[PDB]
Amino acid sequence: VAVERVESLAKSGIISIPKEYIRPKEELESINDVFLEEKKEDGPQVPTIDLKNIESDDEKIRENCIEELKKASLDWGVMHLINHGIPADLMERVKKAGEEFFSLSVEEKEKYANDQATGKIQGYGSKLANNASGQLEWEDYFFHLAYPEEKRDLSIWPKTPSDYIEATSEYAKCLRLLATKVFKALSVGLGLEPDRLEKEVGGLEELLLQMKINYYPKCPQPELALGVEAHTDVSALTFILHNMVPGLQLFYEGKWVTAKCVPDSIVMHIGDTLEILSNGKYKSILHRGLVNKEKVRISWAVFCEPPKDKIVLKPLPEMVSVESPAKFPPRTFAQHIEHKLFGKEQEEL
Numbered sequence: 001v002a003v004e005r006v007e008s009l010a011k012s013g014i015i016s017i018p019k020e021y022i023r024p025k026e027e028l029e030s031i032n033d034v035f036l037e038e039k040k041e042d043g044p045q046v047p048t049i050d051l052k053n054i055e056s057d058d059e060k061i062r063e064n065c066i067e068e069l070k071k072a073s074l075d076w077g078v079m080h081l082i083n084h085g086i087p088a089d090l091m092e093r094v095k096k097a098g099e100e101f102f103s104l105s106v107e108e109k110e111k112y113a114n115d116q117a118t119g120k121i122q123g124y125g126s127k128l129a130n131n132a133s134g135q136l137e138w139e140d141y142f143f144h145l146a147y148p149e150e151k152r153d154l155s156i157w158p159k160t161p162s163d164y165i166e167a168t169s170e171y172a173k174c175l176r177l178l179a180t181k182v183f184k185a186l187s188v189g190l191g192l193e194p195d196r197l198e199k200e201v202g203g204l205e206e207l208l209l210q211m212k213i214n215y216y217p218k219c220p221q222p223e224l225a226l227g228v229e230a231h232t233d234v235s236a237l238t239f240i241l242h243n244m245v246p247g248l249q250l251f252y253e254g255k256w257v258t259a260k261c262v263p264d265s266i267v268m269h270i271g272d273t274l275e276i277l278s279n280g281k282y283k284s285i286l287h288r289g290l291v292n293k294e295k296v297r298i299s300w301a302v303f304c305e306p307p308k309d310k311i312v313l314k315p316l317p318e319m320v321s322v323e324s325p326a327k328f329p330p331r332t333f334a335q336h337i338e339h340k341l342f343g344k345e346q347e348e349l
């Protein structure tokens, strides 16, 4: 087999993109210039949710924060979090380290190559075509488990820059504390005991944080490709940092909305795992990512996942009734991923 990286392809001297990267005719109509889209301020916009008072001693103010978070989660399921408690300089260090790793030559990065055939899903990679369509997306990435610390395989983590492990480790620990805060507020929002949702997704012991650095090289025909296809996240929550190059779009009320770049914020997505547990109340929104011909875009997504086999995910009893039937059948996290991949494979077949 050939190992083709999109960064290599982007630098190979091509004029047009290979056919495998061109989206189906029906999808091309919704793809426009990301910079022109980012400038548009009409239509619904991704909400900015202020978490400053999420754990305030002042009850009215705390409840107001919880309600705003709850409301954004039932409606959009995605938002720009501000005053989230993660130090701004730590986030800049994490991004700088990721930028430095991706600036290494493809050859240096191949020393970290993943190997799906032997189950080595961590490391440097690019999505291999996995259905009859043969469709590929315009991005390379680096994926690794980031937390808990005892479950990490540090040997696969970038050794250049020298501070990648230190920075990424601190960031994951900070995000783990923020996930607890969020899970609690979302639990309260559904009328559940504060510790309910985090317990249901594994708690401190089994919830995993996976880091995925998404690298989107410049594209010569950005109107014909997607950096990441339309999808919903399978996690419980996802927290993402960006390098201020636009690209994230959200499918809201039947239209693709472009996310604006809100300084110092962290994008947070409610994922399929919480949507399933809340019986459809909290929303896992369909989203995608655009590429462009002017600037390399990079994002850092941390997925908070339940244990893949140990928990059977299904709507919580409290969220189901005669009048509110279960909107999802029971599946473990692995089974859910397989079902989404299976439905797509059958679709393309």
Ligand SMILES: O=C1c2c(O)cc(O)cc2O[C@@H](c2ccc(O)c(O)c2)[C@@H]1O
Pocket: 121, 210, 231, 232, 233, 234, 235, 305, 337, 340, 341
């Ligand atoms: O490779 C993948 C993957 C993985 O390797 C490890 C992991 O822990 C979770 C994962 O999740 C997969 C997935 C599938 C369909 C989706 O809609 C989605 O959001 C995520 C993904 O393809």
Ligand SMILES: O=c1c(O)c(-c2ccc(O)c(O)c2)oc2cc(O)cc(O)c12
Pocket: 121, 125, 126, 127, 143, 210, 212, 232, 233, 234, 235, 238, 303, 304, 305
């Ligand atoms: O959206 C997701 C995604 O893209 C990937 C991923 C991981 C490894 C790969 O090799 C890859 O091609 C993709 O993992 C995820 C894990 C989650 O818990 C939730 C997600 O939403 C994703």
Ligand SMILES: [Fe+2]
Pocket: 231, 232, 233, 287
């Ligand atoms: Fe996503």
